[model samples]
Target: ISVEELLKLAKAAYYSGTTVEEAYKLALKLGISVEELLKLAEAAYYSGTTVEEAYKLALKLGISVEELLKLAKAAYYSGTTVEEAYKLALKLGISVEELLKLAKAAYYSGTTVEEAYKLALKLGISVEELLKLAEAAYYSGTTVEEAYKLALKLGISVEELLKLAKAAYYSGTTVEEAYKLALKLGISVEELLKLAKAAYYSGTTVEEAYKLALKLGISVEELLKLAEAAYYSGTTVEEAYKLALKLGISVEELLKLAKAAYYSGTTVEEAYKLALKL
Candidate 1:
């Protein structure tokens, strides 16, 4: 066969899904250029796959297949072309990951990618940060716009607002209540989260727990332990701590007497009186 005829045959074989090795051998036997055969094989392989669209754009744009696929996926979901998506991302000075997240948010939120991107730009936040606020809103059953507005009102970042929302959720309080608690405790929202978790475990409200911590001059951690001991002793956290303070004893020692009263079904005051031979 002539070289042209062999090349035609090789192209047909490739179209029919024949192995490149087989096409290479056929080309070699017919004295066709191996480079031409390889090039044809490469084209056929890419053209036969779903990534063909990306492959063509990558060729024209001089981008790697991996990077192009990232842009392609985002662009495909956003109803835009790879060239347009990539150009917009570059113009916005954002990474492909940020653009992808914006596209995902737009797809799920029933908005256009351009709209979401513009919102992020207008809000002076990255797409990644916007999505974080969106996620927090989803879990907290608040709207992302509401959260953003609240963040602006509070003069804090959306990330900080998320922390405040988390504290509120964990402590079974409203965001306003959590913010008030933070102000009352003179702590950041980040510190408030720790107190919220402690309050959760101690079965006390955040306000109750932190106020007691301030009064007793103890850490919230120690306050939680004391609250637990008070719970098992069938007394209020305040009563138990006040009794310990009055007796000038460690709360641990007071806990032992409380436990004795609990087992004997007597009051802690009676147990202490009997133990002290009073």
Candidate 2:
């Protein structure tokens, strides 16, 4: 397959979190051989997932690493996380439990994602400054799921982390983007992951929220989802509503989720009706 087609395969691999070799096997079904598959890394290096994999593949394909990196940055800017995995988790034919678990891990592990917005604002970091830090944080580990929460708390923008990162890069670096530069210079994924958790536990520039999520990652991403999944996954819409009525989440919050659910294109009206039925 050509670079474009190969890139699609790369996305499928990431979406499935499957092995690239495995993705190669799948790509073969489209008539691309394993060797040609390696050429695709030139494209994969620009994928939303696995830059290292793409980098190695680029060498195998005789592509320049520096050039490939430039591509990675472009892709990074356009490839901001859209919570695709989490959205897919809620979709049909996917394993909800596994996806939710995956989301929980990525989300909580991505503590910076949750707070970059607020942290950026608190530091007088521009919206653009905040996003790059967030991107590196997420790329290296920040989950978009949690970013929304911290940003909400900080009154920051959840929509622009990538734009911010690129701008920061142009500025010759600052404390905010410094952490991301650390990753770009090669921090271990494990260390990056830990840092994400630490940043969250420490409260991105906040200090308090960091510990809160660190101690109870669930309190943000999994807590309510798990509650709803447990209470509603197997039950009818009406039954779940009755169950919700028995609990004590705020009315505004309940409406918020319902509205969110509706906006998300699920059976939102069903949820609202169920809420009343309860």
Candidate 3:
């Protein structure tokens, strides 16, 4: 190529957001073709992979430029080796995307590849289920052992645990405490979740909600109704409690009125009047 032509290409490349100079050096080291070098440079930029490191890893793996791209992406994002992720994907009959999930979970939780592999194999768990375990343990600030024990004791499925974990993450429930409550009340995970959500919306702790429910000799479902009533009425929990006490009616009855008001296109005042007439 002519000097002027080459200079123009260089300038165009420099401003292309691809870090072309670094790619030039990397292409030299890896003996990459000019077209491949440009592709790698663009890939590296978008994938957050340094050209030097990508080239180095590419050279070692002796894989195609495309494979190198995927490898660098998985390694950078998930802290997994290209070969390991590729092999695991093949072994599990899963896609690289799926393996990347497992790898990312392991990376975040400090679980080694071997450890996760062994655990999944021994438990006969799918990668999706395994991800729930990892996220619960890591994000809940509990050990894997504790999370496993909790899951086992509750007889909760991975799906159930994931739901509980969402509640826990949002401060609606403590997985530990929910487990204790479930055992105490013989409530299933589904019931526990509803109660936890009710408590969350009612501006009370789950323990406190359960305690009040127990005092009233009411089902948790009933307590949740009262909470729902309070929410729909746009009244405070304390106000709902005082109103129920003054009316000598169950909190649930008041909630019915509130729900009627909310769902029947009536004002709270009108609903209260209708409720009184009943």
Each prediction's TM-score versus the true structure: 0.39, 0.20, 0.40
Give the poorly placed runs of model 2, Cα more than 4 Å off: 1-155, 169-278
lDDT of 1 at 58: 59
In TM-score terms, candidate 3 sits at: 0.40
Error of 2 at 3 (Å): 10
lDDT of each: 0.66, 0.41, 0.64
Per-residue error (Å), model 3, residue 172? 7.4
What's the count of clashing pairs in each model shown? 0, 17, 0
Compared with the true structure, what per-residue lDDT tens digits does model 3 show for residues 104-158? 6576567875577677777787766677888777756776556767788878776
Segments in model 1 whose C-alpha atoms lie over 4 Å from true places:
1-96, 99-115, 122-124, 201-203, 208-278
For residues 150-266, write the lDDT of model 2, one tens digit per residue.
455534454433333232333334324634544563643233333343343222431332233356553433333333333323443234344456554442344344443333233
By lDDT, is 1 or 2 better?
Answer: 1
Off by over 4 Å in 3: 1-47, 50-73, 80-94, 176-278
lDDT of 2 at 212: 39
Global local distance difference test of model 3: 0.64
Per lDDT, the best of the predicted structures is: 1
